[PDB]
Design a protein around this ligand. Structure first.
Ligand SMILES: CCCCCCCCCCO[C@@H]1O[C@H](CO)[C@@H](O[C@H]2O[C@H](CO)[C@@H](O)[C@H](O)[C@H]2O)[C@H](O)[C@H]1O
Ligand SMILES: CCCCCCCCCCO[C@@H]1O[C@H](CO)[C@@H](O[C@H]2O[C@H](CO)[C@@H](O)[C@H](O)[C@H]2O)[C@H](O)[C@H]1O
Ligand SMILES: CCCCCCCCCCO[C@@H]1O[C@H](CO)[C@@H](O[C@H]2O[C@H](CO)[C@@H](O)[C@H](O)[C@H]2O)[C@H](O)[C@H]1O
Ligand SMILES: CCCCCCCCCCO[C@@H]1O[C@H](CO)[C@@H](O[C@H]2O[C@H](CO)[C@@H](O)[C@H](O)[C@H]2O)[C@H](O)[C@H]1O
Ligand SMILES: CCCCCCCCCCO[C@@H]1O[C@H](CO)[C@@H](O[C@H]2O[C@H](CO)[C@@H](O)[C@H](O)[C@H]2O)[C@H](O)[C@H]1O
Ligand SMILES: CCCCCCCCCCO[C@@H]1O[C@H](CO)[C@@H](O[C@H]2O[C@H](CO)[C@@H](O)[C@H](O)[C@H]2O)[C@H](O)[C@H]1O
Ligand SMILES: CCCCCCCCCCO[C@@H]1O[C@H](CO)[C@@H](O[C@H]2O[C@H](CO)[C@@H](O)[C@H](O)[C@H]2O)[C@H](O)[C@H]1O
Ligand SMILES: CCCCCCCCCCO[C@@H]1O[C@H](CO)[C@@H](O[C@H]2O[C@H](CO)[C@@H](O)[C@H](O)[C@H]2O)[C@H](O)[C@H]1O
Ligand SMILES: CCCCCCCCCCO[C@@H]1O[C@H](CO)[C@@H](O[C@H]2O[C@H](CO)[C@@H](O)[C@H](O)[C@H]2O)[C@H](O)[C@H]1O
Lengths: 449, 449, 449
């Protein structure tokens, strides 16, 4: 009388909760709340790190992104990823507006559809604020909200379906992605790169010549953002087992250790490159790099290897940030360097260090990586990383270029039509300017001449 | 040997934990921690939104309210609501100072008394900081603490008993209030209105004529407060099932969606009313309106109806804020508009959209609302809303007026006796003024002439 | 086939999770996340309370301490406390780099080693930021990180083993320490005192003569730190049962009530001592005092006695702060007064109020304290308090003095060699100075003349 389809059965005839371990459900419910607070974590981080004055407050934009993402997910985002009648590349509209989303075992069988919807919806929201942060410079809010809705639909949801969907081709191939390093981090990173290369300011003074690599808008925002991110990451990674087993807590140990060693590695790198100074910004970026790096691996690799997921992503991401000076582009490039490069590196190394005896902690069966002489695992990881980066960069490019040719949907005004943050007899007046007291978004204005 | 009364049994003879599902207990324990952080959430929100400089820091006052509320609840607050020998209108002193509060099944049978005490005590504390926030302008701290203790005792505890107590008359009548929209939001809102009409400043310059509707003290405090509130609301609503069932996670999906759609609706409303600007304050107030609106409904209504609990409260509360300009009163009116009006609207609409098949997700039995052609449900909701508003407004009025006639308990000094924030030879001196560095409350001083 | 040693068994032959209640594991996993956010809680608290401008940002230093502590714990910290082949005074290197830490029942049998490692590692990190905060004035970061690593190894880990280890002598003697009042609070407090007496500035102008007792750097940081601490303390104390029983929720009620009554008591004390003012700093310090006080007792004492663990530590710690004016030393003394004195007082009073019927709520067997006419319990508590204070003060002294004689490991430069916060032709230049925008630690510089 448990149907396994639709709502899962008739609530007046069966107790749909009997299909699940109650403790499994509580941990995934708790983990969903933890991921939610990562959303303002992202907004605080990238507002504080910025080397220029964004007119849009990214702390506030995180709440905007939480609203847009939750509506998109309810509307059809959840269905396009986690419908049960998917087609290798995408889901369907079977769960449009969460129709019949209730007590059937989800793609992750240990939790019902409705709880998996709550949990996975937080991942989409985290990705939404990463994208708004990447593309925030001189953004117009109306076009940005439309962009987020579309981008979640045709960039996030296909990549997420490939990684997590019932018939997703990356699942079937054998690619490993424990907590969504592809859909969340690598995807947003390479979409950010599309923003940088197509819409970011060229020959940017903050990135041109010998300018300071770190010039933060607000160190206290960076620290608070990193606090929220690390705190929430326990749900992000620890919840990706779908259960209450000790593999969940194993993945939390790996998460903590990769962040710790990433933070120390990046700071040590900067200590050598500067000739002896201690980078406060660097420690935080290094913790994020390690957190990103361990994301595809946390439930698959032995604890002692988690330090490598801090060390190696921190080193590589540290040097990836230097490319901003070569391109002379700042906009969007921090998100690409931490999440795009970091996610690529972590996904790659999961193919090296994944171990079948770690997955088996809760009975999960995998062939393993190079730890289990499963050599082609590395090739499965590279196939996933290249497909994510290619789809994300290409489709995000198309979206941005299409909207740029529609004057009322142009996300970022062209320089020749831009007007200095003015406000609506014969003279005009300024509406300054202090985001701490201004109740309205300082929206870019188009020139009327 | 499980007695079901007093402590529940002898700990040396029985394992009182065997009466409960351990996972049910863990979720309610976690949900209690989540509600606790809503307390500073309220303080940050109303400090940041204020159109005038409150001498009392509401972020700090939230910690004060957490202290006063926890002591009151232990003293007799818990007993007056959740004693097992209640009388239709109030509990008793049987659990004075938490005497014999341990392992008997609480009014919510899935958790023991001691855990239900922890959980429900957080609701009283949230209500306490809502009240301190409503009445904070020019408040004297001593009188305010006394006021909170008394107000929790004779306003909150009776209303909470009616809504949740074992023999509460609203329970017996069939009124629905999932997570305490009456005791927390509608109650504090209409008590705030009593403060506005009796003690708030009249002909207030910030509310007189064509003044800006939004003029926030601190947008970053508003955003941080909204972060804490939304984050904590998952425990507030999700924990109100009393269990680990998937109806808990259903209610979290409803909570997230109502907040999202409320935030977007309020911002869209302001976009039309302003002629095209994006209100940063408005998005946050709209999320709160949706969170308040869904509170009586989250575990009773189908997911697709949760968007209505964002849209409709956001529209109505947006226009309710305009009444500050008609009365020319600012003090206390934001709390009334969001929690009083929002809670009334949400409680009303629960009678329309409550569905027996949603309650049945965990075996809870209800007749339903208009969704189940149970037409008189709407009348049960209006009976509860009118009783809460009438009791809260009337008794809060009486408390405020009584204390106003006692010079050492007067909460707010009269203008003729007030003295400009001075400090204790022949000349007097100022003690400025910066709440960031002043270690003492800037307490109003009575004129000695 | 459950071995109870090493990894606990073969994951390919047995399900190691079957040895544990899943709900017990979820609560301890959640409690671990809660303790983690106490780490920045400490950093915010002591940065905001400071009566002088620390060059090191303690909010940021909390992230540094989280990194150093997590690596030390993985390296050998966990093994030195919780290896299964311990020797009365210390553990071993059997679990070096978390080797074979998996599914054997930990010293707390209701959870496996890997989860107990995650949980107890957060306690070590909280202690690390308490120590960095105590010794932060004019600290050099390199030496400070080395100091933290060494101090965790030879001060924290022995004291923790005595209190919690399988063969720890304080366990065997019968000393009670529910949530680590000795290892975390009393230990860091008396190590802080060693910093004060050996390295703190003497005849300090902020502590000399009739200077203000409270002169906070940032009240908003104090409040935010206290928010994080109280919020996280639910995991700190509530998780120390190791299980999902209602004794966990009993301990949360005690925790909340001690904080509430501590906050009110300290503020009332200052109200009398000042002649009528309301101390905003005092309320927060009082909540911390009550939280510290209840830490050794929360799962052992009846609820109505928890108010005494707020009142008595708040009074005594309030007067302990006055000793800064007698010594004319400020550096490190707040940590000693709140955690050293508070932890001593709480540990003492646990011997008075511990009750066997409270421990028996989850089947834990103890003789009790004076509540059960077990008179020698008080002597067991004093033996633990004196051993912790003596070991912590003495070994911390030795570490600080040894490093002070090694010029590249000197934590705090001597005044004759110190140079005013300068930066690396013929003239030198300043690198000001604003921690909100400076991406580098303002590291003390040694004089080159
Ligand atoms: C910010 C703008 C917000 C716009 C969001 C749009 C909100 C409303 C979307 C309408 O969606 C459908 O409405 C139907 C009814 O109107 C539902 O059918 C329902 O019909 C029967 C009862 O009405 C039930 O038995 C069915 O299970 C149930 O699917 C259906 O589920 C739901 O998908
Ligand atoms: C299915 C996709 C449909 C669109 C296909 C068009 C592809 C053409 C190749 C790229 O063309 C360039 O794209 C830029 C980006 O649009 C334009 O820069 C313009 O737009 C940039 C982004 O706003 C600004 O930085 C520049 O100032 C401004 O010249 C630029 O003129 C245009 O030659
Ligand atoms: C498609 C990818 C298949 C490449 C060839 O297959 C294997 O690749 C590894 C390439 O590294 C070799 O292991 C080699 O490299 C490993 C690196 O860890 C070592 O552990 C092994 O001892 C060493 O034989 C291994 O011999 C070889 O058959
Ligand atoms: C900020 C100011 C703080 C003021 C708060 C007041 C704190 C003390 C209140 C006293 O409350 C009563 O004290 C009795 C003892 O003194 C307890 O009886 C107790 O008596 C026996 C043991 O003493 C037990 O078997 C009983 O169960 C137990 O109820 C009783 O429970 C408790 O309600
Ligand atoms: C059981 C209840 C016992 C009390 C019953 C008294 C009811 C009388 C009806 C209302 O009376 C008014 O109440 C106001 C509020 O008290 C007073 O305003 C006074 O108090 C206000 C609040 O502080 C200030 O705004 C005004 O300046 C100040 O005139 C006002 O004088 C008084 O005529
Ligand atoms: C005490 C309150 C009792 C009022 C009268 O009872 C019912 O009230 C509804 C008033 O709305 C009517 O439904 C009417 O209104 C509903 C609104 O949803 C519709 O669904 C129904 O089709 C429509 O018959 C219904 O006929 C009527 O018996
Ligand atoms: C910031 C600087 C970071 C420095 C931190 C140092 C990180 C690496 C430490 C090496 O630790 C050991 O490495 C061995 C292998 O290299 C492991 O043996 C392993 O050997 C077999 C597989 O290799 C397994 O069956 C064993 O269980 C397993 O203990 C062993 O566990 C582990 O303790
Ligand atoms: C196994 C332990 C090995 C070391 C044993 C040495 C024990 C000697 C007893 C204490 O000696 C004093 O220690 C202080 C602390 O070192 C020194 O103050 C020096 O160091 C202080 C801390 O930096 C500064 O405040 C002072 O300016 C500076 O004179 C001081 O000269 C020295 O007489
Ligand atoms: C080693 C410590 C042993 C000291 C002597 O032993 C007991 O100590 C208590 C010292 O207080 C006495 O109780 C006395 O003090 C208690 C304080 O609560 C009271 O409850 C008792 O009634 C009262 O007999 C008690 O008689 C005495 O045998």
């Amino acid at each position: 009388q448990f149907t396994g389809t639709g709502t899962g059965g008739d609530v007046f005839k069966v107790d749909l909760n009997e299909q699940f371990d109650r403790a499994d459900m509580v941990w995934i419910g708790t983990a969903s709340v933890l991921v939610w607070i990562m959303i303002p974590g992202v907004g605080l981080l990238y507002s504080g790190i910025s080397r220029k004055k964004h007119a849009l407050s990214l702390m506030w934009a995180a709440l905007m992104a939480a609203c847009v993402a939750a509506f998109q997910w309810f509307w059809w985002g959840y269905s396009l990823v986690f419908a049960h009648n998917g087609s290798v590349f995408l889901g369907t509209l079977q769960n449009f507006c969460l129709k019949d989303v209730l007590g059937a075992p989800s793609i992750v069988k240990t939790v019902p559809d409705i709880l998996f919807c709550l949990y996975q919806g937080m991942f989409a929201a985290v990705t939404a604020i990463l994208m708004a942060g990447a593309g925030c410079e001189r953004a117009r809010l109306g076009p940005m909200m439309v962009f987020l809705f579309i981008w979640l639909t045709v960039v996030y949801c296909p990549i997420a379906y490939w990684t997590w969907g019932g018939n997703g081709w990356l699942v079937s191939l054998g690619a490993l992605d424990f907590a969504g390093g592809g859909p969340v981090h690598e995807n947003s990173g390479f979409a950010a790169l599309a923003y940088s290369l197509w819409l970011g300011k060229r020959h940017d003074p903050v990135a041109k010549g010998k300018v300071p690599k770190y010039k933060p808008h607000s160190v206290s925002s960076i620290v608070m953002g990193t606090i929220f991110l690390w705190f929430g990451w326990y749900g992000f990674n620890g919840g990706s087992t779908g259960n209450s087993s000790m593999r969940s807590w194993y993945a939390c140990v790996n998460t903590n250790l990769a962040a710790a060693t990433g933070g120390l590695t990046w700071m040590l790198v900067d200590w050598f490159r500067t000739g002896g100074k201690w980078s406060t910004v660097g420690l935080c970026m290094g913790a994020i790099a390690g957190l990103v790096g361990i994301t595809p691996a946390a439930g698959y690799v032995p604890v002692y290897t988690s330090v490598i997921f801090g060390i190696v992503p921190a080193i590589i991401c540290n040097f990836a940030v230097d490319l901003k000076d070569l391109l002379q582009i700042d906009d969007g490039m921090d998100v690409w360097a931490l999440h795009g490069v970091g996610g690529f590196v972590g996904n790659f190394m999961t193919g090296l260090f994944a171990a079948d005896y770690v997955a088996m902690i809760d009975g999960t069966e995998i062939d393993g990586g190079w730890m289990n002489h499963h050599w082609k695992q590395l090739g499965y990881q590279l196939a996933g990383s290249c497909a994510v980066a290619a789809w994300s960069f290409t489709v995000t490019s198309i979206i941005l270029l299409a909207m740029d040719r529609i004057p009322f949907l142009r996300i970022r005004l062209h320089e020749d039509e831009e007007m200095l943050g003015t406000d609506l007899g014969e003279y005009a007046y300024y509406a300054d300017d202090d985001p701490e007291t201004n109740p309205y978004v300082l929206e870019p204005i188009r020139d009327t001449t």
